[PDB]
């Protein structure tokens, strides 16, 4: 790990170069030394605030919601210094982390960021108040590149199938839970109860992890199957029969 700390009481201009130094290092390590670098930029919202201060120092007229008119290209300047390059075995990835002012995803900071990034993780509040860690809500999250990240030769054959089925099962379980609140437990059928059981055990076993348990991709998929084997084969509509026959039993 190469760690850069720019403190809240440190010079606000230094906060602007900090992510530039982090990426400058990442580019050296990744592309010149043939290795894969994960770059984590924490509290880009604090960067954006420092950037607005620099704009004021230049006596520039503020743009939308007080931010510089060039905030778009400035964020792209940082964000896009990543990815793979031809002829070299290194790479840079990024996980920018952004605080949503007033918890409004419409705010220019998460809006201008998301508009030029590929999907989102999206951490919720309800999951936190329910004392679930990590508090990540899988329904509003998206990784547009997951289709290329996973599959035979990269993770496991069934990766894509387990993900798609779990997503549908969780979304349905939430839908059944909403129904339960209206009609009661006795008004539910057997399939609805399976989706309710999945929802409760999915969050408790699959999503809830703890900060010191490291679950590799293969254990994560195996845990997924433990949740999927709640259902009989006929209800797992999004998993091809070939995948079920190999992985479903046992």
């Amino acid at each position: 790990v190469c760690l850069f700390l720019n403190l809240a009481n440190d010079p606000t201009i230094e906060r602007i170069i900090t992510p530039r130094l982090a990426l400058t290092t990442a580019e050296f390590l990744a592309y010149q030394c043939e290795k894969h670098v994960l770059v984590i930029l924490t509290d880009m919202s604090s960067y954006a605030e420092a950037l607005r201060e620099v704009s004021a120092a230049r006596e520039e007229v503020p743009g939308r919601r007080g931010f510089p008119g060039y905030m778009y290209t400035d964020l792209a300047t940082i964000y896009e210094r990543a990815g793979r390059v031809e002829g070299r075995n290194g790479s840079i990835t990024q996980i920018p982390i952004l605080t949503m002012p007033n918890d409004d995803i419409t705010h220019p900071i998460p809006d201008l960021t998301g508009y030029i990034t590929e999907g989102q993780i999206y951490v919720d509040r309800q999951l936190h108040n329910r004392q679930i860690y990590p508090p990540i809500n899988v329904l509003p999250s998206l990784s547009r590149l997951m289709k290329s990240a996973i599959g035979e030769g990269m993770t496991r054959k069934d990766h894509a199938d387990v993900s798609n089925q779990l997503y549908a099962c969780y979304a349905i379980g939430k839908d059944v839970q909403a129904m339960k609140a209206v009609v009661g437990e006795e008004a539910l059928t057997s399939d609805d109860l399976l989706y309710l059981e999945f929802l409760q055990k999915f969050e408790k076993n699959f999503i809830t992890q703890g900060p010191y348990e490291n679950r590799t991709v293969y254990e994560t998929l195996d845990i997924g199957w433990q949740l999927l084997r709640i259902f009989p084969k006929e209800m797992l509509k999004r998993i091809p029969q070939s995948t079920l026959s190999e992985f479903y039993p046992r």
């Binding site: 006596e59 007229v61 503020p62 409004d104 209206v182 009609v183 008004a187």
Partner: protein, 214 residues
């Protein structure tokens, strides 16, 4: 009317967005209530259609059986009508918690008090016994029949009331919230512009003052 008439502000944006989310959630939860009531209604519709038809056929058999009892006994109806004191069958009220709405249903209750023993006319006891059984069946069907009908009427009112509320959210309340929110957003951008104008002129006036000093 067209808007909730909340003065444009960032505070209004937060309230309207939360209000919109609430209205949308209520719409979906009430829609689920309606769907649950509709399924039971439709299942109850089929049950009532099966019952009413059967009731006809059962009365056809009971009426014939009565004629048979009459053939043997002669005029037993007079004794039965005059000599009445206690019932063997009574009906208990039960509640059917079909959803948030609770519907009244009747339930057959076989209280057990013995019926009149009649062998006085031609001793036609076997025909009277078959006749009792034929009507006993009719009584149980009719109880179910009413019970289904009462729960059904209460549910049909429940469906129309729930659907009317859902329709109002969709056609009256949300459109109005969305118009209010769009109004707020537009007016706030208008305020941003006039602030931009003033700040730009301030920057230009400062540059003009600086030129004069040179």
């Amino acid at each position: 009317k067209d808007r909730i008439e909340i003065f444009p502000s960032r505070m209004a944006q937060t309230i309207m967005k939360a209000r919109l989310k609430g209205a949308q959630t209520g719409r979906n939860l009430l829609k689920k209530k309606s769907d649950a009531l509709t399924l039971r209604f439709r299942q109850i519709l089929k049950k009532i259609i099966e019952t009413k038809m059967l009731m006809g056929e059962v009365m056809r058999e009971a009426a014939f059986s009565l004629a048979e009892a009459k053939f043997t006994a002669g005029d037993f109806s007079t004794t039965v009508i005059q000599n009445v004191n206690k019932a063997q069958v009574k009906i208990r009220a039960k509640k059917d918690n079909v959803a948030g709405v609770t519907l009244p249903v009747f339930e057959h209750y076989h209280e057990g008090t013995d019926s009149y023993e009649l062998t006085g006319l031609a001793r036609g006891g076997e025909q009277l016994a078959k006749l009792k059984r034929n009507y006993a069946k009719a009584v149980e069907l009719l109880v179910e029949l009413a019970s289904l009908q009462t729960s059904f009427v209460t549910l049909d009112e429940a469906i129309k009331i729930t659907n009317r509320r859902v329709n109002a959210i969709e056609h009256v309340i949300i459109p109005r919230i969305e118009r209010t929110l769009a109004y707020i957003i537009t007016e706030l951008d208008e305020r941003e512009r006039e602030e931009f104008y003033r700040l730009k002129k301030i920057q230009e006036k400062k540059k003009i003052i600086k030129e004069k000093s040179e």
